[PDB]
Amino acid sequence: GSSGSSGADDFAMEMGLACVVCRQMTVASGNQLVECQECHNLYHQDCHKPQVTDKEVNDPRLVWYCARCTRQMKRMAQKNQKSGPSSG
Ligand SMILES: [Zn+2]
Ligand SMILES: [Zn+2]
The dihedral of CA 16, 19, 24, 25: what is its sign? Answer: negative
Looking at residue 75, the DSSP 8-state letter turns out to be -
What technique solved it? NMR
Contacts of range 52-55, beta carbons closer than 8 Å, 24 or more positions apart: 54/29, 54/30
Q: Which CATH number describes the domain made up of 11-74? A: 3.30.40.10
- Residue boundaries of the structural domains of the chain: 11-74
Ligand nearest to the CA of residue 40, numbered in listed order? 2
Q: How far is CA 68 from the centre of its chain?
A: 8
Look at residues 15, 6, 57 and name the one whose alpha carbon lies nearest to residue 35: 57
The answer to whether 71 and 79 have CB atoms below 8 angstroms apart is: no
d(CA 60, ligand 2 centre) in Å? 17
d(CA 28, ligand 1 centre) in Å? 12
Rounded CA separation 37/64 (Å): 6
* Cα 78–Cα 74–Cα 40 angle in degrees, nearest 5: 160
Look at residues 34, 37, 8 and name the one whose alpha carbon lies nearest to residue 21: 34
